């Protein structure tokens, strides 16, 4: 199947540039145009341009002409988009998308979309989160459950991901959207509901990633010290 894997989230200061990559697989790379489309937070889709991986010819959106550059490497099946002289208004999720299969630029349209790369342009300072365990209740009752979790505190900018036990634990996980505090920093929590009877026998680790700051934390969440049962 067609697969498009993009590079990770980025943060930039105004005036800087950013280069995003899109690694393609599952089809003959040089036989399909690649589009780029961006979406500012809460806003609509904006086409940025298109590149022919055969030969490398490009057509860019008129509004971006002069500061966007698309390129490709046919040996690694990777397409790149570089945007320069960044401003706050360039904050967006940037998508690469394989064309449907047109043999002409005219009438091309994006069909298979990558997962997107969030690029935030801000003068504010980047900050990686602190991660704290949210310990489960010490209660012990037959068939009982307990909530345990991780607090991902004070980061900027978005986004953050949280998994549990490397993605092996998914049942009963609820990761909450972040709050944006008056400080300008975000916080979020992820909680898992699990059997109480087995607390202390099961290992629970939250894997937190904040790519813009290259922060990666894996925090063990254990029963309370005061818990005499688990």
């Amino acid at each position: 199947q067609v697969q498009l894997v993009q590079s990770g989230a980025e943060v930039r200061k105004p005036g800087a540039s950013t280069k995003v990559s899109c690694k393609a697989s599952g089809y003959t790379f040089t036989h399909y145009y690649m589009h780029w489309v961006r979406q500012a937070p809460g806003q609509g889709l904006e086409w940025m341009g298109i590149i022919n991986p055969s030969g490398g010819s490009t057509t860019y959106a008129q509004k971006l002409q002069g500061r966007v550059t698309m390129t490709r490497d046919t040996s690694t099946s990777t397409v790149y988009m570089e945007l320069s002289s960044l401003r706050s208004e360039d904050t967006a999720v940037y998508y690469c998308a394989r064309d449907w299969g047109s043999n002409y630029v005219w009438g091309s349209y994006p069909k298979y979309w990558g997962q997107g790369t969030l690029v935030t342009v801000s003068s504010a300072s980047t900050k990686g989160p602190s991660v704290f365990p949210l310990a489960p209740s010490s209660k012990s009752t037959s068939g009982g459950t307990a909530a345990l979790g991780c607090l991902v505190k004070d980061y900027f900018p978005e986004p953050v991901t949280v998994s549990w036990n490397s993605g092996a634990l998914t049942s009963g996980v609820h990761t909450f959207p972040a709050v944006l505090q008056s400080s300008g920093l975000y916080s979020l929590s992820s909680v898992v509901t699990v059997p109480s009877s087995s607390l202390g026998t099961q290992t629970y680790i939250c894997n937190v990633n904040h790519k813009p700051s290259n922060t990666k934390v894996d925090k063990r969440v254990e029963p309370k010290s005061c818990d005499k049962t688990h």
Binding site: Q62, L134, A135, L151, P177
Partner: protein, 220 residues
């Protein structure tokens, strides 16, 4: 400002038919075929309709597209909760010599027409971790889930007295089960956490309050 014009919002109840308009000009929709994309929350767009009225494999027949002059329309019959998403029309524009998009329509799916039952929020309140306290900080975390309709207000108490300073609360967000969630955070100094018998998070929903309380020396 987008080149094609769509309503910002459309809503319907489960089971009904809704339509989403897309108005353009002779240089785009008037001359060229229309595509539609569906973008579920937190995901990339997927192609929903191409060539005015064609469905890619996997897209159900209850999605249908049409075009008439310089306008196009997406109809969704048998509306389902999972259809809640942003929908975008698109077409080639001969004048601009490139693909153009509509501004997007957020489709919301309401509760059952015959009346969706109220659901009270479930509240979980965590005290500050030992780890955070050792760093000379303290955060109480109030997690609110499974409520309907999707509106709550949150109040915090130190003992029995209101605290407004240090409170940060999210907007409500839709869960996978179609109920709603939110969270609220209370920032305190470790000394403040020590200085009261307890703190409480009080969630009010449709006139009823659900409260949780935590204390610095208990073992809940």
């Amino acid at each position: 400002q987008s080149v094609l014009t769509q309503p910002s919002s459309v809503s319907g109840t489960p089971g009904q038919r809704v339509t989403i308009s897309c108005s353009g000009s002779s240089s785009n929709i008037g001359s060229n075929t229309v595509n539609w994309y569906q973008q579920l929350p937190g995901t990339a767009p997927k192609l929903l309709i191409y060539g005015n009225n064609q469905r890619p494999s996997g897209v159900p027949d209850r999605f249908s597209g049409s075009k008439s002059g310089t306008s196009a329309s997406l109809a969704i019959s048998g509306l389902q909760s999972e259809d809640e998403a942003d929908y975008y029309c698109a077409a080639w524009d001969d004048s601009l010599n490139g693909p153009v998009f509509g501004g997007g329509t957020k489709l919301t799916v309401l509760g059952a027409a015959a009346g969706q039952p109220k659901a009270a929020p479930s509240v979980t309140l965590f005290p500050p971790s030992s780890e955070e306290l050792q760093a000379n900080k303290a955060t109480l975390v109030c997690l609110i889930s499974d409520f309907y309709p999707g509106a709550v207000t949150v109040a915090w108490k130190a003992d029995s007295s209101p605290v407004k300073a240090g409170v940060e609360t999210t907007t409500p967000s839709k869960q996978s089960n179609n109920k709603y969630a939110a969270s609220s955070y209370l920032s305190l100094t470790p000394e403040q956490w020590k200085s009261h018998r307890s703190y409480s998070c009080q969630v009010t929903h449709e006139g009823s309050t659900v409260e949780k309380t935590v204390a610095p020396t208990e073992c809940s």
